[PDB]
């Protein structure tokens, strides 16, 4: 029937309002935000050419670093930063093709579908070796905004990444299944994280990159040992706030 | 004593959707308080129900959120939307954006039309929903043969039209390679019943905003990933 | 009968922080009695609350636990400390030593000043805490515009000043690469309100010891390892 | 603390018939409603009990669902079926189709004969079931020596004959390489007791449809796969 969209809200009707019909609803709860985001989606990739028993040193090789920033939003080395930082845009890895892969790391499924302005959750991370050669790797998890501690080994022939009280994982051997998974709690000093844009600066002289919030991540993962590893994120107890537009899709 | 175990044939497999958790490596940590927050929502369906804009074609093939009507009654529909959450006309509505991440839908669809012409402009439209089987309606005579509502302009500016869920199956696909009887469900066409009528000093063309959203009993199910594309 | 098991994808992984135990290989052993012991403490926070010394710069750029004041009132602060558990001036306090092993903090900070001049010396200081946003206070007029306390010398020797926890976020970072609005929180500056005043036969320079510690409602969280260094 | 486990010697084995389930990767999904449906059945035995056609040989060696009888009483049986769910004559009956997927059977077999001659045609048949041990019955005298029923034509068109389950073993094999005392169980032969008799103007040959199915107390057990073949 008639209404007035200028009110900013109109009723949700079913066929019975204007016609001789009945409501036809069936129970369904797979649209719940928690359920939807509670599944693992590819969100990053990591590569290392250093052995386990050596000093970890930040490196990049064809757009792959040996450490990542834990955030569904695009991240990459920004203006020669030592470690990857959150990006404000996505770029093709290739300077010519104008087709993906992108040089930036992110959870494509999150970027392409995040109809909210802020989110809150714990993060379940899965790290998988891209081939079947027996794994021998050490990973260090650094909480949001904590010291990276990219120091020298304090003892000969030991993985510098394991030289910490920070949570770290060590998998190696013929009995392992070439992967690692674990869940970390939300560690940002922010109450909720911005899911798309942050309309401001991060420091007091407003000289940072406008659009990026301060400490808006889940920490970092540093890796040593040989191999290329893919990473997945799974959002536990996910909560979202303030509905907002989704990424635009080209007209068919 | 140790427990005997039978290692299943899928040892070491990483299931991206297993309904189970993994090992907590930094527990006993407080999640930074956010009790002051507002605007939280828990169901993606909430989004589907917010009316957002349909993309209509310009005379220059440019996309606009409305269609034109004037002092005449064309023998053809002013606009035609195929009922599919795949329709290109609704490709950028929140409804379609959410539906792209689910396999099936069920329930009502709400097509909202907002008359933006002058207050001195009057007229009547016939909004029709034609179920499939006999093709698209070619005339007003045919369009009236199906589900329809007559929209009369006046004090109230908009008309909330519902495309009833009429289907051979309980659920319908949100997308498809080729149209099937389970993924394409007919057409919504709006006709000019009486011409837009008005006094002198009033522009001949009136613009009617067009929006879509899920109705009261609308639902989606089966989380999936849509065909990827390069933004541009 | 044997139990069927699904070997998870992380088989054989050593989790340094799993909240579980491992196999005891020398059990039923008594831990050598220590019931006679004293001085036990169970929370590292206890340490953070013990006031320890701040390192101020000498006129020869040497570090000392105090600052100087005399018969005059400079137009600039006698000392300036940026409130960050990262501040170099507090780098060797127990508070900073403990904070270096945690990711975030919350709560009050106590800055303790102990007047060490002669008993015949009098004077007043204005201790100010300026929240960020408008930069460091450039004059006494500006410093007084923020949180401050006037310290009057006399019978009681020290002044316990509290930097209130004023923050956009519930928790703040204990360290950083580049200062952010979640890791740097303003400045504590102490000004000479009235000049140190005294009779003849009294040295012109008075030394005020400076210490810091966490306040009553101060807390730290998230055990981590700080950037390693070579002792020297 | 972690639980000690003893990995059995069959680790990683995929058991096609383990009575256990595996990991659900798309749970909390509603199975499209089908409450409107009809015709559901839950036991394959239901099928075995539906009488379906036996394939008798033509005079041109072509398969037909009936046999012929006329105004004479042959000294040999009109048809002979060996009781085996393997008999080629019943190879395409639902009974045999289902039995091919099970290892053993037990219980009654029902052989249904439907007289299709004219209403003016009369006659009597002697349907006999001869258990094994002394070979196939060579004469009517021998056939009558075993289990038999006399079928008299008239108002009622069909005769439901039961081959009693007479066996040294509780269960019998549904198929075999070479006949054994546990897979072959005798013969069902139908003889002409009195000649088919009729008036003038009536075709000399009458056709009797022949069908088989499991009886009331018939059962099958042990799901298996039958020898594969190329359809043609």
């Amino acid at each position: 029937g008639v209404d007035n969209a200028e009110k900013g809200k109109v009723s949700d009707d079913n066929a019975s309002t204007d016609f001789v019909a009945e409501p036809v609803k069936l129970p369904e709860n797979q649209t719940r935000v928690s359920f939807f985001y509670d599944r693992s989606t590819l969100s990053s990739v990591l590569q290392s050419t250093s052995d386990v028993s050596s000093k970890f040193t930040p490196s990049t090789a064809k757009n792959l670093q040996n450490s990542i920033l834990l955030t569904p939003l695009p991240s990459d080395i920004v203006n020669n930063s030592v470690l990857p930082e959150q990006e404000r845009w996505i770029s093709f890895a290739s300077p010519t093709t104008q087709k993906p892969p992108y040089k930036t790391k992110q959870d494509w499924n999150f970027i392409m579908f995040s109809p909210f302005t802020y989110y809150k959750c714990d993060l379940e991370v899965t790290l998988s070796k891209n081939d079947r050669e027996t794994i021998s790797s050490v990973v260090r998890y650094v909480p949001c905004g904590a010291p990276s501690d990219l120091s020298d080994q304090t003892m000969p022939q030991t993985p510098s990444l394991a030289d910490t009280r920070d949570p770290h994982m060590w998998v190696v051997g013929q009995g392992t299944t070439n992967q690692i998974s674990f869940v970390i709690p939300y560690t940002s000093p922010l109450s909720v994280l911005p899911s798309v844009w942050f309309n401001g600066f991060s420091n007091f002289d407003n000289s940072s990159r406008f659009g990026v919030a301060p400490n808006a991540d889940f920490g970092r993962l540093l890796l040593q040992g040989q191999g290329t590893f893919s990473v997945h994120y799974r959002y536990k107890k996910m909560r979202v706030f303030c509905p907002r537009p989704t990424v635009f899709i080209p007209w068919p | 004593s140790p427990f005997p175990v039978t290692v299943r044939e899928h040892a070491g497999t990483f299931f991206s959707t297993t309904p189970d958790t993994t090992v907590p490596v930094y527990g006993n940590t407080i999640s930074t308080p956010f009790d002051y927050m507002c605007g939280e929502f828990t169901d993606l369906l909430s989004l589907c129900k917010i009316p957002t804009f349909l993309g209509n074609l310009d005379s220059n093939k440019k996309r606009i959120p409305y269609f034109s009507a004037t002092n005449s009654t064309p023998a053809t529909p002013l606009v035609t939307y195929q009922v599919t959450l795949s329709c290109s006309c609704m490709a950028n509505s929140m409804l379609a954006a959410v539906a792209r991440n689910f396999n099936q839908y069920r329930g009502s669809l709400n097509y909202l039309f907002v008359f933006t012409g002058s207050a001195m402009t009057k007229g009547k439209f016939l909004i029709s929903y034609t179920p499939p089987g006999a093709g698209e309606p070619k005339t007003l005579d045919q369009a009236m043969q199906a589900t329809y509502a007559i929209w009369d302009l006046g004090l109230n500016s908009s008309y909330n039209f519902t495309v009833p869920f009429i289907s051979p199956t309980h659920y319908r696909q949100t997308s498809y390679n080729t149209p099937t009887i389970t993924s394409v469900d007919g057409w919504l066409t709006v006709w000019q019943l009486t011409p837009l009528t008005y006094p002198l000093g009033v522009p001949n063309d009136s613009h009617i905003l067009t929006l879509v959203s899920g109705g009261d009993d609308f639902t989606l199910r089966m989380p999936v990933t849509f065909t990827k594309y390069v933004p541009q | 009968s044997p139990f069927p098991v699904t070997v998870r994808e992380h088989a054989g992984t050593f989790f340094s922080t799993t909240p579980d135990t491992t196999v005891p290989v020398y059990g039923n052993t008594i831990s050598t009695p220590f019931d006679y012991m004293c001085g036990e403490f169970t929370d590292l926070l206890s340490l953070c609350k013990i006031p320890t010394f701040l390192g101020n710069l000498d006129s020869n750029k040497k570090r000392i636990p105090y600052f100087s004041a005399t018969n005059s009132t400079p137009a600039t602060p006698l000392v300036t400390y940026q409130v960050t558990l990262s501040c170099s001036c507090m780098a060797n306090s127990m508070l900073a030593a403990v904070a270096r092993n945690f990711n975030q903090y919350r709560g009050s900070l106590n800055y303790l000043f102990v007047f060490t001049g002669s008993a015949m010396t009098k004077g007043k200081f204005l201790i100010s805490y300026t929240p960020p946003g408008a930069g460091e206070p450039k004059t006494l007029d500006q410093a007084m515009q923020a949180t401050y306390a006037i310290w009057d010398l006399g019978l009681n020797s020290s002044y316990n000043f509290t930097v209130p926890f004023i923050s956009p976020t519930h928790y703040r970072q204990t360290s950083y690469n580049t200062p952010t609005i979640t890791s740097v929180d303003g400045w504590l500056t102490v000004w000479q309100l009235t000049p140190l005043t005294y009779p003849l036969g009294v040295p012109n320079d008075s030394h005020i010891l400076t210490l810091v510690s966490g306040g009553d409602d101060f807390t730290l969280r998230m055990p981590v390892t700080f950037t390693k260094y070579v002792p020297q | 603390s972690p639980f000690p486990v003893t990995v059995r010697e069959h680790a990683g084995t995929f058991f096609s018939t383990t009575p256990d389930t595996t990991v659900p990767v798309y749970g909390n999904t509603i199975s499209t409603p089908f409450d409107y449906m009809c015709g559901e059945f839950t036991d394959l035995l239901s099928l075995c009990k539906i009488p379906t056609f036996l394939g008798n040989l033509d005079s041109n060696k072509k398969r037909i669902p009936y046999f012929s009888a006329t105004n004479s009483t042959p000294a040999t049986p009109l048809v002979t079926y060996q009781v085996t769910l393997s008999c080629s004559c019943m190879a395409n009956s639902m009974l045999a189709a289902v039995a091919r997927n099970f290892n053993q059977y037990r219980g009654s077999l029902n052989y249904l004969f439907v007289f299709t001659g004219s209403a003016m045609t009369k006659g009597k048949f002697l349907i006999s079931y001869t258990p094994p041990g002394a070979g196939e019955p060579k004469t009517l005298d021998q056939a009558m020596q075993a289990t038999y029923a006399i079928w008299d034509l008239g108002l009622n068109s069909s005769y439901n004959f039961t081959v009693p389950f007479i066996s040294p073993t509780h269960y019998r094999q549904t198929s075999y390489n070479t006949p054994t005392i546990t897979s072959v169980d005798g013969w069902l032969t139908v003889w002409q007791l009195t000649p088919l008799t009729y008036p003038l103007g009536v075709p000399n040959d009458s056709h009797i449809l022949t069908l088989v199915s499991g009886g009331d107390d018939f059962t099958l057990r042990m799901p298996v796969t039958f020898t594969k073949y190329v359809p043609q």
Binding site: P185, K236 | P19, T21, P24, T29, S31 | - | -
Partner: peptide, 24 residues
Amino acid sequence: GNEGVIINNYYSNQYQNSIDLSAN
């Protein structure tokens, strides 16, 4: 959403999940 195991979690709730707390 997406947890469907009937036996209780092996790790306590404080450890398996971040602890939710209200500041007011």
